[PDB]
Amino acid sequence: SWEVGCGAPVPLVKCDENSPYRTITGDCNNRRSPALGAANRALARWLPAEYEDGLALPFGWTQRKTRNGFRVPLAREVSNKIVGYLDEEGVLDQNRSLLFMQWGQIVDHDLDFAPETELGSNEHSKTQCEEYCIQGDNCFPIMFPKNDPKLKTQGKCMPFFRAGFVCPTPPYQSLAREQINAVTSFLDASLVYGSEPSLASRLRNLSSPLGLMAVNQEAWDHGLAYLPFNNKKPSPCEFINTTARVPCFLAGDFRASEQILLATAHTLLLREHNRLARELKKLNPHWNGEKLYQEARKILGAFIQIITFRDYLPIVLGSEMQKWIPPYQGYNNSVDPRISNVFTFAFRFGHMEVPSTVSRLDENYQPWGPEAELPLHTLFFNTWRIIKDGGIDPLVRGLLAKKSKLMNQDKMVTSELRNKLFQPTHKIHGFDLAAINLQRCRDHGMPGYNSWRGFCGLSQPKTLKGLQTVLKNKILAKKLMDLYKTPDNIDIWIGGNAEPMVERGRVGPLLACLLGRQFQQIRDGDRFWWENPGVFTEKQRDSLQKVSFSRLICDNTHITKVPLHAFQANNYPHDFVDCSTVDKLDLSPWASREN
Ligand code: HEM
Ligand SMILES: *[C@@H]1O[C@H](CO)[C@@H](O[C@@H]2O[C@H](CO)[C@@H](O[C@H]3O[C@H](CO)[C@@H](O)[C@H](O)[C@@H]3O)[C@H](O)[C@H]2NC(C)=O)[C@H](O)[C@H]1NC(C)=O
Ligand SMILES: *[C@@H]1O[C@H](CO)[C@@H](O[C@@H]2O[C@H](CO)[C@@H](O[C@H]3O[C@H](CO)[C@@H](O)[C@H](O)[C@@H]3O)[C@H](O)[C@H]2NC(C)=O)[C@H](O)[C@H]1NC(C)=O
Ligand SMILES: *[C@@H]1O[C@H](CO)[C@@H](O[C@@H]2O[C@H](CO)[C@@H](O)[C@H](O)[C@H]2NC(C)=O)[C@H](O)[C@H]1NC(C)=O
Ligand SMILES: *[C@@H]1O[C@H](CO)[C@@H](O[C@@H]2O[C@H](CO)[C@@H](O)[C@H](O)[C@H]2NC(C)=O)[C@H](O)[C@H]1NC(C)=O
Ligand SMILES: N=NC(=O)c1ccncc1
Ligand SMILES: [Ca+2]
């Protein structure tokens, strides 16, 4: 115990220390310990991993081996019995726009990514797993329980591959298994710019010396830009409609095209960067290209952090916000800014907020066309609807005018995700996000629910009666007990999300604690936190608290009526105001004079 050694995946760089800009890999943020918070390093472990063989074999891997005496139940069985429901009526969040959910997915994607293992392009293991479901090495399939309707239709399992791990990737040995975070821990807009110098460069337009991001050349959205198309074939975006042949978008983060709405938001940010850059060029004619890139980049980062901490978190945590995130006192170099392995599962509460359908609205916020409301599942890796069916304006209005889904103990995840999820790799619209989340909890060797309740100083129920009290639900507590036999065994993903919500928030006591700590840490340990004295100027900071997502919309679409508070539920037209009634980000404080 104490390694500090093991680390084949660098890639290492030299630190400048007087550079006023963040590296792209996240390196050099912390001067004493320069790799803290960098992309491609192990996720942090707040608690010792809990694997079946104590090292890397996940629970449920070996049939004959129990966990605390009992067999862990199949991911899908838990999915079938606890997580799914049929009635979408009455399910929407009365005070959260659809944007509430989509911002979460953006933030989370800026902070973490544990990609799956490769070791296979020109591979049969990709197929010895999909076709016959043989568990082995990195294939760790999700078996269907008896009486599951996907048996008669899909096969005997859903292919699933274990997450990538530090040092090698290969067979391997030694210490406990640690998963990789392929992105930077700092809230630094890494999802727009990339986390590798390799990708960050491809993304840029180095033809023009104006510091812009490369835009699409085959198509436009009323003279406005779109993200470039990705080079790679086979592309999944052209697969869902072999006819329209539209590839996925190339963006800072690889998951950008996962669903039409996420792609949309990515477009807004790409656009704000370029707009920000042509404006800086206008007041500092003399600045060079990189100067424009970095400074534009720097602003957008500050923007993502403000919206997130000022607008978003307080309605996620509710009354529990001040208790985990006291006000900012300044940079603290003794804080571990690394994303913990558990945070990547607690932040998945967002999955219970995804509604079953997506809408496009017209200028008066009316159904745009005859097939205006689409089932969420026709939108996974759907790029052609944007390019070939209206642009993003119709979708952005839907973001502002529709509601998020409200987590609900009797109605957790929509069937659009629990039964019809499309994986970029396989061919069917038949995966189960819920089962995958659970299978991945085990892949990552996460401690049980009660381990996490103790961590947060919350009571730990040992009995049915005990758990009814904490969940405030007899039916749920029961279902759960029958499957897991002991609360010690409840997987944290479902454990945390089953708890009733906190006052004015959207997650419970356990999740609030986990989320709260993480964010406190990425703020306090981020040398480039926007409020950190010296990072920006007093006059610059003053201009930055006037940013709002509403404005972002005005400056980058042709939408003219927007809500003043985009995250709460807004009705058209009473709640919407004209874009000219809205605080603009004044860039005058970024002007630079010679003598
Ligand atoms: C329609 C919207 C969404 C889709 C289709 C979707 C789908 C997925 C899929 C397929 C995974 C990978 C699961 C695995 O292999 O472990 C994933 C991961 C994840 N989702 Fe989403 N998701 C959506 C929305 C959201 C939202 C709103 C949030 C949070 C507010 C969220 C948080 C996460 C997080 C934190 C992960 C783990 C990231 C990592 O690997 O580090 N997701 N999602
Ligand atoms: C729907 O959600 C809204 C936000 O979740 C909620 O209103 C929010 O309540 C907060 C309480 O802190 C208010 O914040 C500001 O309140 C005073 C003025 O009363 C200001 O001087 C302070 O700056 C303080 O930050 C807001 O009025 C509001 N949040 C925002 C900015 O939108 C609604 O009440 C919810 N709807 C219902 C009826 O449940
Ligand atoms: C695959 O992508 C196709 C488009 O890329 C899509 O079809 C398109 O959408 C409809 C067909 O249902 C047509 O749109 C409208 O065209 C005129 C108005 O401009 C109307 O007269 C038509 O009635 C229709 O409403 C497009 O012409 C059509 N585009 C093409 C080239 O076919 C397919 O539906 C997609 N298929 C799948 C499986 O999603
Ligand atoms: C990189 O930047 C250059 C220069 O701004 C872009 O060239 C412009 O392209 C737009 C859109 O096609 C046209 O209005 C002009 O023909 C060009 N203007 C200038 C200033 O030359 C180029 O399209 C960008 N390339 C990428 C991949 O984004
Ligand atoms: C920076 O963060 C550290 C660690 O998070 C804080 O250190 C605490 O110091 C107190 C003494 O005041 C000790 O009792 C604790 O052991 C430390 N807490 C923890 C959880 O590590 C410290 O509060 C911060 N530094 C400053 C001065 O702001
Ligand atoms: N269907 N898969 C994805 O690529 C993905 C999309 C969003 N978040 C994580 C993974
Ligand atoms: Ca980041």
Tell me how far apart the alpha carbons of residues 65 and 476 are, in angstroms, rounded to a whole number.
26
How buried is residue 429: exposed, middle or buried, by Cβ count under 10 Å (0-12/13-18/19+)?
Answer: middle
Tell me how far apart the alpha carbons of residues 95 and 22 are, in angstroms, rounded to a whole number.
36
With contact defined as beta carbons under 8 Å apart, do 428 and 386 qualify?
no
With contact defined as beta carbons under 8 Å apart, do 523 and 309 qualify?
yes
CB-CB neighbours of 57 under 10 Å:
16
Which ligand places an atom closest to the C-alpha of 304?
A: 7
Distance 254 CA to ligand 6 centre (A): 8
CB-CB neighbours of 495 under 10 Å:
28
Hey, whose CA ends up nearest to atom 38 of ligand 3? Answer: 241
Tell me how far apart the alpha carbons of residues 144 and 75 are, in angstroms, rounded to a whole number.
9
Distance 88 CA to ligand 2 centre (A): 28
Which ligand places an atom closest to the C-alpha of 354?
A: 1
Q: Which is it for strands 429-431 and 421-422: parallel, antiparallel or unpaired?
A: antiparallel
DSSP element (H, E) containing 358 = strand 357-359
Q: Report the pocket of ligand 3 as residue ranges, CB < 6 Å.
A: 241, 243-244, 384, 388
**At CA 86, angle to CA 84 and CA 89, rounded to 5?**
120
DSSP element (H, E) containing 561 = strand 561-563
Binding site as annotated, residues for heme b: 108, 258, 351
DSSP 44: B
Judge if the beta carbon of residue 348 lies within 6 A of ligand 1: yes
Distance 366 CA to ligand 3 centre (A): 21
Second-level CATH architecture of 1-595: Orthogonal Bundle (1.10)
CB-CB neighbours of 46 under 10 Å:
17
- Which residue from 97, 217, 201, 153 is spatially nearest to 428, judged by alpha carbons? 153
Alpha helices in 89-170 (DSSP H): 98-111
Judge if the beta carbon of residue 205 lies within 6 A of ligand 4: yes
Q: Where are the domains of the chain?
A: 1-595
Structure tokens at 27: 């390196």
Judge if the beta carbon of residue 329 lies within 6 A of ligand 4: no
With contact defined as beta carbons under 8 Å apart, do 180 and 163 qualify?
yes
AA identity, residue 178:
E
